[model samples]
Target: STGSATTTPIDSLDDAYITPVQIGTPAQTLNLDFDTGSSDLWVFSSETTASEVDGQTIYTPSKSTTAKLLSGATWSISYGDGSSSSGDVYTDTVSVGGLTVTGQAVESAKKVSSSFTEDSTIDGLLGLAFSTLNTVSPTQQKTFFDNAKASLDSPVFTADLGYHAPGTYNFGFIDTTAYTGSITYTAVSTKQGFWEWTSTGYAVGSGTFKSTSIDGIADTGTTLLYLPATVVSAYWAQVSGAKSSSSVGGYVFPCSATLPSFTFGVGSARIVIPGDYIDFGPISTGSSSCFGGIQSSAGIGINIFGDVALKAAFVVFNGATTPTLGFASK
Candidate 1:
């Protein structure tokens, strides 16, 4: 079996990629963010209290006769700044594109943070990471991909994330047309349950590659590229009027400053991210100070090759018995 879906940026900043997902008997479709960072297929639902349910399209278990609540099942997940959501679980027929997973554990939110409540565009997140990271308690549940992999012709999926434009996520097969040249393979260390890999080195624009080993996760849920302080500083140093500002909460620079392209090694291959992708946008309206898409991850305890870096290449999450990752230039 194979499937494909078109994913588009939910906001102007390309914060998250939202795709249509079908749940329940009558096909209550909701636009969910396909997040490779965290695990848990949680959604804003009828179970959520009115106060936490903004303008989102909630998945109503009552409306779908096929939706069955998993009694005693519960889950919770949190992100930066204390934003969190948690609630009950439901086993329902969920489908993404042509791939269908019966008895899919769909977590229904009973509570949500103000930040999530304010972002009405997102219904919820569909996790693509390993199920080990799933927040479900008492009994962990497999992710959508994990459950469907056995039926897939190949236990693999490809992510073609975009830059403002819509991209494709393909399951069980790779679209040769989606990428150019040869794909470089890297062993993924699933010890942490993330799509973790080690990059060979980095190059700022057309400069020399430092040949430094940088370990990071390819996270679609995250918005920016986060590296160690030394490398982040090196990249910003190339731009005029750029500085690491605590006031701005990250590295900021003159809006008009020329941004150098970023390049990181995938085995012998070098994926170069265009300079335009680094200019996250102005800090405030009519302000010259703009936040850099790449920042230091000193405190985060892990480097993240988020959307900023993933958008530059075609990434394949190989889910065979022994997992691996593949990157190709596009």
Candidate 2:
């Protein structure tokens, strides 16, 4: 906390929020993500076809007068779900919070597929994880933190996943007001883009079943958390009026029933899975089937703790000092 200064407020845009900063002058903006698994910043370009972009937000050059694309450089990204996109490298005169960083590298994905186009609402994802997982090469590029380090009194970048406002992911300085008790910090490991934890056990409804246990990873990039089949079936058994359904390829339960809360204990941290999050959407057709935040881990080895889980707390990834993951109240 050496260069402690006034707090910088971020700008909340139409589809998402961004922070403004100055390099030589006030010139660049960056989106915020509470990612503890990867490191990079990418955005869509105006040259991209409408069909190529889906379920995500795209930054059209016409949309911003100050944005500029870097000549000659191209970029692409592929996900584990068989989705991918490629585009050119560009720089935008952008801003995040109050700090300004000019000529920032922004990947412009020109070619995108349907899977990426249909399911998401945002344009592109920014990797706020660690440098070890950075998709960018050369290792000389400045991440959001690297650029902001000039303005920040210290080298720390703290993120408070939206707790008060649903779906809002805020980043910048560490907010210590969220936690009442002392925080327990864990050393960061170079696991698969996820801060994984060993599951102690599983249960169904209010019954205390101790045999089922599994290990899972927490991923902020993923929207929903996926669990194993054994745990899913056991939890479904406790749901009142639970029935087999082929509708969404998941189980359906009555919404009026007293659905018991499932607890996940990662070491000493206890996280409760909310009932509403469990209930599957589109309730109009009596599809009261709760979407198991946990999905079948048939082909995969680990469970993913997606955005839903990350939003519940204040997460601090202290990569600058040491490889560690810290959780506090938000």
Q: Give the top-scoring candidate (TM-score).
A: 1
Residue 57's C-alpha lDDT in candidate 1? Answer: 97
Candidate 2 regions exceeding 4 Å error are 1-38, 53-72, 99-103, 136-142, 146-159, 162-164, 167-172, 191-193, 197-215, 241-247, 250-252, 255-258, 283-290
Give candidate 2's whole-model lDDT. 0.52
**Window of ten residues with lowest summed lDDT in model 2:** 6-15
Off by over 4 Å in 1: none
Tens digits of per-residue lDDT, candidate 2, 1-330, equal: 121122221212111223222212232232333344445566654677877655454566555555664555665667655767677665665444444455666666677767656645445556665444545443324455555555555455554444224333323456566554545565555565455555556554456646445566656665555677677677767776875466755556666665566655544655555555454443355545444444455556667666545554555555454455666534
Candidate 2 displacement at residue 204 in angstroms = 6.0
Candidate 1 residue 28 Cα shift, in angstroms, is: 0.7
Give the TM-scores of the predictions, in the order they appear.
0.98, 0.72
Which candidate tops lDDT?
Answer: 1
Residue 119, candidate 1: C-alpha displacement in angstroms: 0.9
